[PDB]
Known about the structure:
Chain A has one domain (1-176): Rossmann fold (3-Layer(aba) Sandwich). Chain A has 5 helices and 6 strands. Chain A has helices spanning 15-24, 87-91, 93-103, 130-139, 156-171, and strands spanning 2-8, 38-46, 49-57, 77-83, 114-119, 145-148. The longest helix of chain A has 16 residues, at 156-171. Chain B has helices at residues 12-20, 63-67, 79-87, 96-99, 103-106, 108-127, 134-139, 146-149, 156-163, 167-184, 186-190, 234-246, and strands at 41-42, 49-50, 58-60, 75-77, 94-95, 153-154, 213-215, 222-224. The site of one zinc ion has 7 residues of chain B, from helix 11.
Amino acid sequence: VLLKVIILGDSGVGKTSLMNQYVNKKFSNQYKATIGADFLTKEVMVDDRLVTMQIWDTAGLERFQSLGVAFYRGADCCVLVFDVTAPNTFKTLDSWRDEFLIQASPRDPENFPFVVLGNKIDLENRQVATKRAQAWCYSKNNIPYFETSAKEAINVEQAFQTIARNALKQETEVEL
Amino acid sequence: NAQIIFNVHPAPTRKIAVAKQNYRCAGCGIRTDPDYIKRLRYCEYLGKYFCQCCHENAQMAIPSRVLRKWDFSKYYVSNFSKDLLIKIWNDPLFNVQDINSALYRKVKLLNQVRLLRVQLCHMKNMFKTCRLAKELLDSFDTVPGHLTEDLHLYSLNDLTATRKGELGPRLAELTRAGATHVERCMLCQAKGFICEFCQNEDDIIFPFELHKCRTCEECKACYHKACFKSGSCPRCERLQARREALA
Ligand SMILES: Nc1nc2c(ncn2[C@@H]2O[C@H](COP(=O)(O)OP(=O)(O)OP(=O)(O)O)[C@@H](O)[C@H]2O)c(=O)[nH]1
Ligand SMILES: [Mg+2]
Ligand SMILES: [Zn+2]
Ligand SMILES: [Zn+2]
Ligand SMILES: [Zn+2]
Ligand SMILES: [Zn+2]
């Protein structure tokens, strides 16, 4: 069993760091804009069963154009990361889901697993309220919400275990 | 055996040209006898007349005459023009589409490098973002910088090398090495496209495969030829219906 996970969201919200923190329990404060989509692999186990996640982080800046996104296909789960301190990236959440459902194109797109990460809860200029983001995810077919910090390992292991769990469910169905 | 050069009735087209430049040599500014303008020589590149010191009948192919017809024959140029054309030989100054787009259909060897250059510019953008194709990026610079980052700029060197039929070969060698890296390296396959129209996820198209697909060049989204040509691009229909409901 192999799961494909795709991490989306505006530049500098913490996609490369949440994935470095989860896969390698590492974190460096030096920012390094990711220019092309690439992946890491973590093996986890659910119920005696060995499963392997393939986690893709993206270039949230503006190295989209002329370059395609065929790697969305077969996505078993999609992760949307916003910055709790920059309220604009929470606004562009709709934009990222809507485009992903158009490029990956799963059967039944509104029962497709999304997981929303509010990153950087360790900083003190937090603008987006938890009960505001919790409501937005309740709007979109009840999708999980995690306030996380790649810096301090806050709810990171929680989030990517939910992503694994939800992907695992999604993968076993379009085999049906 | 004196020459006969004084003339009350010089050629009217030359009298118009010399007089347009106040009877002054275009290279040294010497003021010439209006009754002796037969002595002057026309520089076929600068378009102006010169004294026989500044212009000594050096011959040179002419940019405009290479870009309007495929004409490489040498023409009499002023010393200043021979010097300057030699200087800018390898400079990417001439934009074929902006100057004369029709030439792309009269010269086959030139359309071939235009096409080869279109592929190389898409391969380059992908190799800039694929950490495994970095020795292929170094091979992209065995040719001038501008051949793979722009599509319509040529230098006089490239135009000649195209007529001698050698520029295609050096570029075909590169659009093959690149085409096999993408077939075999699926960090580059991951940046391929799925046609938004048909959604066939079994045929991942890339922008350099101009046989198969046509690329939008506002969105640079990639679609099959079959699926596009008619109508607009769906990508921008949303992107600017986005700010549409935001405003
Ligand atoms: N305090 C704090 N800083 C963080 C956190 N997550 C990321 N950062 C920092 O924010 C900066 C940007 O985050 P990155 O993950 O590197 O950028 P990204 O989201 O991958 O954006 P792109 O790589 O351009 O697509 C980096 O310097 C991180 O170290 C966090 O949870 N808390
Ligand atoms: Mg990144
Ligand atoms: Zn002169
Ligand atoms: Zn590659
Ligand atoms: Zn198509
Ligand atoms: Zn378009």
